[PDB]
Amino acid sequence: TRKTYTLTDYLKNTYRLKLYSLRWISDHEYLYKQENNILVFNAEYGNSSVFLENSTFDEFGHSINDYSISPDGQFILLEYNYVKQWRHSYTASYDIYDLNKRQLITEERIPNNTQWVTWSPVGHKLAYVWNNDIYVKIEPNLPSYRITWTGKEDIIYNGITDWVYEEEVFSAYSALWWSPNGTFLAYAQFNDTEVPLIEYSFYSDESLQYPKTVRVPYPKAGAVNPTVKFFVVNTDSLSSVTNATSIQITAPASMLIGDHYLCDVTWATQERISLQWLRRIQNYSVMDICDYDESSGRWNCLVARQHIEMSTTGWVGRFRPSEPHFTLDGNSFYKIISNEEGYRHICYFQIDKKDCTFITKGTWEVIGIEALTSDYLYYISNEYKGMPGGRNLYKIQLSDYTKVTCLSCELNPERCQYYSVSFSKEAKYYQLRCSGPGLPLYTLHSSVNDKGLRVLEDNSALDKMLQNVQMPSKKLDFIILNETKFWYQMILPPHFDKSKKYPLLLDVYAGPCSQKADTVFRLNWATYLASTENIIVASFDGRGSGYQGDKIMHAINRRLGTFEVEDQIEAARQFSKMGFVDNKRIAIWGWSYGGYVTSMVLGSGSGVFKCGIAVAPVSRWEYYDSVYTERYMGLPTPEDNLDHYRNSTVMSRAENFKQVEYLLIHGTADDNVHFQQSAQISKALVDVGVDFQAMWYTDEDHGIASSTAHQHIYTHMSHFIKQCFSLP
Amino acid sequence: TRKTYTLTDYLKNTYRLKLYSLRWISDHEYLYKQENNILVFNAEYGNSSVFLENSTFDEFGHSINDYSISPDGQFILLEYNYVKQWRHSYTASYDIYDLNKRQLITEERIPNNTQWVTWSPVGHKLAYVWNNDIYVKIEPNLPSYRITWTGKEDIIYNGITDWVYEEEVFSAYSALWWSPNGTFLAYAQFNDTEVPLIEYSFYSDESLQYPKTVRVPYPKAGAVNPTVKFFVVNTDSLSSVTNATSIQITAPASMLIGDHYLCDVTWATQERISLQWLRRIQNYSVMDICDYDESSGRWNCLVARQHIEMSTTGWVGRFRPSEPHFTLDGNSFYKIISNEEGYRHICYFQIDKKDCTFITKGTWEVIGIEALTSDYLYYISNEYKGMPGGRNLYKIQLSDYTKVTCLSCELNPERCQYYSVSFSKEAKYYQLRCSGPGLPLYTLHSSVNDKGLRVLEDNSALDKMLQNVQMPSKKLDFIILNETKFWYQMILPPHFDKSKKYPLLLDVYAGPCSQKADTVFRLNWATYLASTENIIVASFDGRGSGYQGDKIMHAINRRLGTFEVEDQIEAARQFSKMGFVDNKRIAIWGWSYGGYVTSMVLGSGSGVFKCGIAVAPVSRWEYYDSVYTERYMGLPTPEDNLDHYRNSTVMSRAENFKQVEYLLIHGTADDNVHFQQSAQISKALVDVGVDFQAMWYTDEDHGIASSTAHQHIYTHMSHFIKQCFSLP
C-alpha cells in the first residue's frame, strides 16, 4: 500500500517543486544559478558558459546572502550580514567584486547597515541608502556623493519607504527610480513626524533581562499619515566640491488640497517621467507627465498632459492605480483601467489627450501588461474558457485590435491553465512559467514566430516521486447566487467517493480582490488534510473577490465584514447540502483578512460551523493601517463611515461564539496585524463567558515563519481540526 | 440524593462564609456595618447605636468605596473614585465630613488623585501624599502645609513606596509613620533614578486605537536598586515656621558601605524611634534606636542602643526582620528572633544591652506578638499539639515566664485550631477569629478575666445550607522523611473509600516559608474538584517550608528550584504508596512560585505526573524582582551565585515536556511576575517541538481577579484537568 502526503512531508518539504529562476541580461542572454555557480545562457541555442565559479568566494569570510551583477557584467555586488526588517525591508553589508581585474574592491566600500542598493539600469553606477540618506557611486572604487542630508531614523526617509508605504503602496523598501540610461535618479522622501507609533514588547533570547519595546511609526485608520515629496537629481553633474541639487516635482493642485499619496513612478523616456498621485479618499487619482527642460534644469508637468482616473463605485485600481507602459518615443502609453462595464482592460492613451481608446474588451479581465513592441502588446488575462482562475499569455496586434493571439492556451491544456511570463530586454524571447493544474513547467520561446524553443524544467523528478503517493485532486467549479456565477475549489481526498460523507474545512481569504479558487498546483497544509486525514478543503470567491469585474469586486465598498462574510456562510450552507459533505463536521479557517472573516463567520450565529481557527486576524478596522483600511472603508468619522467601522468588529459578536469551538492564534511581535487585535477578541470572549483555545507565538511576526514556530503552529492546528472532526 | 459542590457554586459564590469585621475606636467600643448602616457597639454589654445612618450619603453623587473615622471621632474621611494600582497602592478622591456639624467640608479639599491619606493616631491631623510629595493638614478645613518639594513621577517617592518596596518590604503603599501622639511625622524617600523599567502593553477598552505602554521602575535580580533616605518632621512647628525642617536620620556605617534597604520603622515613645536596616545580602540587619535632642532639634542614634541581627544559614526573618514591641517607657522591647536551635521565639531586650533573654522556647514557633500590657504579652504560636499548621493565642506573665496560658486552645478544639485576634485600643477586649477546621467562628472576650462575652458570628446559616451538600473532607497528617516529619493535607471526595484508586491533583506553592498544610476551612476550586469530580487535592510542605524551624526553612538557601521541587515529586510517590491513588492519573498545578515549581516538576523527567497547569509562573530568577529573589539566591554574578541562577530555569528543561500535557496561563498586564516569564517558557517549548496548551488573559494582572477572568480561568483549567483524567 502507498503512502499518503503527511504533515511531516509538508513541514519537512519532502516533495519539492523545482523552479527555473532566470535573470535576463540582454535581448538574447540570461543568467541562471546552477550548483552555486552562475551560468550565462544563449536563448536562441541553449548553450551556456560559466559566468562566475562557486569557488571565487571560498575565502570571503562571510556567508553571502545574494548577489547582483551590474548591467554591463563588469561588477558583482555581494550581499551579506542580512538582517530582516518588515515584509520587504532589511539591512545588509555589501562588497563589490571587479569581474575583469578579478579582485574585491577595498576602496570607498559601501557602509555596513545599508538599507537599499541598486545598480543603474545601464552601466555600473550605484545608488544606496544608509541612515535614511541617499548616496551615489559613479564607479565602484570611487567616493560616494551624498545626495540628501535630512535622513532621520523613524522621521525622514529619503529613497526608502516608511512602514505603510512599504507594506501597502510600493510592496518594496526602495523609493529610488533611475532614469532608463541612468542619467537621472528620482526619489521620494517620506515624513513621519506626526505619525503615531505602534509599541509592542520584544522578548529576545532568554539572556535578555528586560524586554525591549519596539516602536514603529504606523498610521492606524483615520490617524495622521506620513507626508511625501518627490525629487529628481542629475547624476552626471555631481561635484566633490558642491552639494547635489535635487529638483522637486510638486503634486498637482487637486492633490495638495488635502491628504494624498504618491502611488506610482514610471519613467517614459530619458527626459520624461510619469507620476501617479492618489487622494487619501482613494477614488480619485491623477497622473502627471513631466519633461526635463535643458535650458532651466527644471522638470515641467504640463496641465494638458494630466490624466485623471476615478471611480464612482469604489476605489481606483485593484490595490492601487495601475502602471503605464510607454511606447519607445514616450508620446503614448497603455494602461489597464476599469471600462464602462466594470471590467479591467487595456486603454491606449496619447500623452496630451483626455480620451483613451480600449484595445481589449469582454466579460473577463487583463491581469497585467507584460511587454510592448512597435507591433504587439503582450499581456496576461483570464479570458480563456471564461475561467477567472486561469491565466494565459496573449499578444494583440497594435495596427489591428481584432487580431488577438493566445500564446500559451494550447501548449498543454490539461496540465497548464495558469501562466506567468518573463520577457528578454526587447521582447525577442520569453520564458513561460506554468504553475498548474499539473506540475509546474518552464519553457523558453522566441517572439518572431512564437516558436517553442525548449523545455527548461518539467518537474519530471517530482512527478516520479508523487507516483508512489496517494495525492488529492482539485475540483474547480461554480455555484449561482442571484443570477451571478461564483467559483469555488475543493481539494478532494484520494479515491474520492461521492457516496461517502466527508468532513469539510472552508479555507478563507475573502478580502477585496482576493482569489482562492484557481488552477494553481500547491503542496501545502490542505494537501496533508485531504491526503492523510480525508478532509475536503474548500475555498470560495464571493462578493468582493477579484478578476471578475467591479460589480463583484466593489460589492463590499464601504462595507467590509458584510457580503464577503455572508457569502462564505452561503457557500458552506450549499456545500453542506451536497451528498458527500458531513453537515455535522464543517470547519472554517483563515490567516490575516481570512482570520477576520473566519471570526466574523464564527460569531454570525449561522449554526453551520462546528469549529474554526483564526490566525493573526484583524478584529476592528480602526486597529488596521490607514492605506489598506481606508481604501475600502473611507474614514472612521461621524461625517464619513464611523457607524460601519463600529458595526463590523469581531468583539460585538462575542456572545455568538457560545455554540462553536474556536482557536485564536497570534504572534506577539506582529508589526502588521498587531497582537492588540487578538488581545481584544480574547477579552470580549472572556467578558461574555465563552470558552475557547488560544496560542501566542513569542517574538513571531505576521508570518509565524521561523522554522520551529511554523512546525509548531501547523502541529497545533492539526490536533485542533482532528479533535473537532473526531479523527484519531 | 444530595447535590455536590459544583464549579458554578464556587464561581457564583452560592455558599458564602460570613465574617465579622469590626473596627476598634477605643478600649471599649467598635464600629460594625449592618445593612449599610455603621453601628457603634459597647464591647462589655453588646448593646449598639447607629453611628452613621446608611441614608447620610444618598445625595453624595459618588459611590463611597471606604471610610475612615478620625481617632477623636470628630470627622469622617470618605474615599471615592478608587482606582487600583499594585497589590496595595491605589489613588482616590476624598471628602471630609464633620460629624458634629453633620456637614461635608467644602474648603481646602484633599486634592483629586491623592496617593495615600492617614489620620494622626490621636486627634484629627491628616498627612497625605499627592504627586509624590507629603502634605499635612492640622485641621480638616484649613490649608495644607507642604513637607517635600522633590516628588517626581517614577523617580522620587516621598511618603509612599516604589514598586519593590510596596510588594516585597513594607506590604503597603504607605511610607509615613506618625509618632504616638502625632507631634512628629516620620517618612521615607525612595529614589528610583537609575532603576530600570519593565515595559508592557496595556490594551484597555476596545475604543483605544493604540495600546498604551506601561513603564514601571522595577529592579530585576542583580539590577540597580532604589536608594532610600529617612526623615522626621515636627508637625507642631508647622503653623509657626514658614518651612519646617525635615531632619534626616542616616543609616549606620555598616549599611552605608554598600546597597541596603530600610526594612522596619517602629515608634517607641513620643521622642524615640526605632529603625531596622537590611544589607542587600539579606543575612545582616541593624536596628538603630534614635532619640529626639530638644536642644539641637536633631535625632541621635546611640551606638550603645544598636542591635545586630544576622544569619549564618540563611536570610534574616521569615520574609524580613521582625518588628519590635516596646514597653510603655520605651526602655525595653520584645521581638521574635531565631533561637540557637533555629526556632523563632520571643526575645526580651533592654535598649542598651546587646544580649537578649528568650521568654519562650521549644520545637515550635511564635507566629506574631499581638499585644503588650504592663503585666502580659499576648502572642500567636503553633505550639498546640505540635501541629505547625495550627494557630492559637497565648498569654505570658511578664513577672513570671513559667506562667503561660493558652487562651484559645480549648474553646472548641474540634471546630477551632486556627486563630487570629483583634485587641481593643489598650487590650481590654479581644475578638477571636477561628478560621478552621470547622466553619469560621467569631467571638468576643474580656481581657480582665479571659471570659467569653458572646458569639459574634457562628456561620449557622451556612452550616444549614451545607447539610444538603455532599462536602469533601480534609485530612491533615505527616510523613517521615530522613527522620523529619513533613506535613501534608488532602481534600478528600465525599464517601472516601481507601479500597478505590482516585485521580490526584498536587496543589503547590512550595516557596521559602510557605505553608500549604494547615487547619483552615476553605470553599475553593479544590472543594469542587473533590466534591463533584472525585479528585483528591493534596498539598505538601517539604524542605524550604515555614513555621518549623530554620533547619527546614533554610534548606533551600541559595538553591531555589532544588529540594522544594524534589520534595513535591517525592510527596506524589509517597501518596501513591498509600494505596488509594491511581498512579496513571497524577496532576500538579500552581500559581506564581507554585507555577515555577509545577513547571520544574513537569520538566524533571520523573514520569510521575501525567499533566500540570502553571499560572503566572516564574521561569528564570533573573526575571524576578531583586528583594525577593536575592533574599534566597544572593546576586546573579560569577563571584556569587550566577551558576545556580542559570541552572534553575524552566527553559533548560523544555525537552522533558515531551513526556507531559502542560497548560500555561498568564495575564498580559502582570506587573509582578512579568508576562515575559511565560513568553520565554513558550518560546523554549516551541524551539524543541513540544506541543502544549496556552491561554493569555488580556489586561489581567498577577491576580487574574476580574469577575469575568476569574470565572474564565477556572472554567478553562477544569476542562483541562477533566480531559487529562478522562472525566466526562
Ligand SMILES: CC#CCn1c(N2CCC[C@@H](N)C2)nc2c1c(=O)nc1n2CCCN1Cc1nc(C)c2ccccc2n1
Ligand atoms: C489584514 C489584511 C489583509 C489583506 N491581505 C493583503 N493585502 C494586500 C497586500 C498588503 C497587505 N497588508 C494587505 N494581501 C493578502 C491579504 C490576506 O489577508 N491574505 C493574503 N494576501 C496575499 C497573500 C495571500 N493571502 C492569503 C494567505 N495569507 C497567509 C499568511 C497564509 C498562510 C498560510 C496558508 C494560507 C495563507 N493565505
Ligand SMILES: CC#CCn1c(N2CCC[C@@H](N)C2)nc2c1c(=O)nc1n2CCCN1Cc1nc(C)c2ccccc2n1
Ligand atoms: C513569584 C513569587 C512568589 C512567592 N509568593 C509570596 N511572596 C511574599 C509576598 C510578596 C511576593 N512578591 C512574594 N507570597 C506568595 C507567593 C506565592 O507564590 N504564592 C502565594 N503567596 C502568598 C499567598 C498564597 N500563595 C499561593 C497562591 N495561590 C493562588 C490560587 C493564587 C492566586 C492568585 C495570586 C496568588 C496566588 N497564590
Ligand SMILES: *[C@@H]1O[C@H](CO)[C@@H](O[C@@H]2O[C@H](CO)[C@@H](O)[C@H](O)[C@H]2NC(C)=O)[C@H](O)[C@H]1NC(C)=O
Ligand atoms: C563593517 O564592519 C566591520 C566589522 O565591524 C568593519 O571592519 C573592520 O573590522 C574590525 C573587526 O572585525 C574592526 O577592528 C575595524 O574597526 C573595522 N574597520 C576597518 C576600517 O577595517 C568594516 O570596516 C565595516 N565596513 C564599513 C564599510 O564601514
Ligand SMILES: *[C@@H]1O[C@H](CO)[C@@H](O[C@@H]2O[C@H](CO)[C@@H](O)[C@H](O)[C@H]2NC(C)=O)[C@H](O)[C@H]1NC(C)=O
Ligand atoms: C542618457 O540620456 C541623457 C538625457 O537625454 C543624455 O544626456 C544628454 O546628452 C546630450 C549629448 O548627446 C546632451 O546634448 C544633453 O545636454 C544631455 N542631457 C542631460 C540632461 O545631461 C545622455 O548622454 C544619455 N547617456 C547615455 C550613456 O546614453
Ligand SMILES: *[C@@H]1O[C@H](CO)[C@@H](O[C@@H]2O[C@H](CO)[C@@H](O)[C@H](O)[C@H]2NC(C)=O)[C@H](O)[C@H]1NC(C)=O
Ligand atoms: C469618493 O467616495 C466618496 C465617499 O463615498 C464620495 O463622497 C461623496 O461625499 C459624501 C461621502 O463622504 C456623501 O455625502 C456623498 O453621497 C458621496 N458621493 C457618492 C457616494 O457618490 C465621492 O463622491 C467619491 N468620488 C467620486 C469621484 O466618485
Ligand SMILES: *[C@@H]1O[C@H](CO)[C@@H](O[C@@H]2O[C@H](CO)[C@@H](O)[C@H](O)[C@H]2NC(C)=O)[C@H](O)[C@H]1NC(C)=O
Ligand atoms: C450601651 O448601654 C449603656 C448603658 O445603658 C449606654 O451608656 C450610657 O448610659 C447612661 C447611663 O446613665 C445613659 O445616660 C446614656 O444613654 C449612655 N450614654 C451615651 C453617650 O450613649 C451606652 O450609650 C450604650 N452604647 C451604645 C453604643 O449604644
Ligand SMILES: *[C@@H]1O[C@H](CO)[C@@H](O[C@@H]2O[C@H](CO)[C@@H](O)[C@H](O)[C@H]2NC(C)=O)[C@H](O)[C@H]1NC(C)=O
Ligand atoms: C536621586 O538620585 C539621582 C542619582 O541616581 C540624583 O541625581 C544626580 O544629582 C546630582 C546633583 O546632586 C547630579 O550632579 C547628577 O547628574 C545626577 N545623576 C543622575 C544619574 O541623574 C538625584 O539628585 C537624587 N534626587 C534626590 C531628590 O535625592
Ligand SMILES: *[C@@H]1O[C@H](CO)[C@@H](O[C@@H]2O[C@H](CO)[C@@H](O)[C@H](O)[C@H]2NC(C)=O)[C@H](O)[C@H]1NC(C)=O
Ligand atoms: C523648604 O525647604 C526645603 C529644604 O531646604 C527646600 O528644598 C530645596 O529647594 C531648592 C530650590 O527651590 C533646592 O535648591 C534644594 O535642593 C532643595 N532641598 C531639599 C532637601 O528638598 C524647599 O524649596 C523649601 N520650600 C519653600 C517653599 O521655601
Ligand SMILES: *[C@@H]1O[C@H](CO)[C@@H](O[C@@H]2O[C@H](CO)[C@@H](O)[C@H](O)[C@H]2NC(C)=O)[C@H](O)[C@H]1NC(C)=O
Ligand atoms: C506629645 O509628645 C511631644 C513630644 O514629647 C510633646 O511635646 C513636648 O512637650 C514638652 C512638655 O511636656 C515640651 O518640653 C517640649 O518642647 C515638646 N517637644 C516638642 C518636640 O514639641 C507634646 O506636648 C505631646 N502632645 C500632647 C498633645 O500631649
Ligand SMILES: *[C@@H]1O[C@H](CO)[C@@H](O)[C@H](O)[C@H]1NC(C)=O
Ligand atoms: C553559444 O554558442 C555561440 C556559437 O554557436 C557562441 O557565440 C556563444 O559564445 C555561446 N554563448 C554562451 C553564453 O556560451
Ligand SMILES: *[C@@H]1O[C@H](CO)[C@@H](O)[C@H](O)[C@H]1NC(C)=O
Ligand atoms: C517633516 O514634517 C514636519 C511637520 O509634520 C515639519 O516640521 C518638518 O520640517 C518636516 N521635515 C522635513 C525635512 O521636511
Ligand SMILES: *[C@@H]1O[C@H](CO)[C@@H](O)[C@H](O)[C@H]1NC(C)=O
Ligand atoms: C552640504 O550640506 C550639509 C548639510 O546642510 C552641510 O553640513 C555641508 O557643509 C554642505 N557642504 C557643502 C560643500 O556645501
Ligand SMILES: *[C@@H]1O[C@H](CO)[C@@H](O)[C@H](O)[C@H]1NC(C)=O
Ligand atoms: C475633582 O474633580 C472634579 C471633576 O473634574 C472637580 O469638579 C472637583 O472640583 C475636584 N476636586 C478637587 C478637590 O479638586
Ligand SMILES: *[C@@H]1O[C@H](CO)[C@@H](O)[C@H](O)[C@H]1NC(C)=O
Ligand atoms: C551572608 O551571605 C554571604 C553569601 O552566602 C556570605 O559570604 C556571608 O558570610 C554571610 N553572612 C553571615 C553572617 O553568614
Ligand code: NA
Ligand atoms: Na522545442
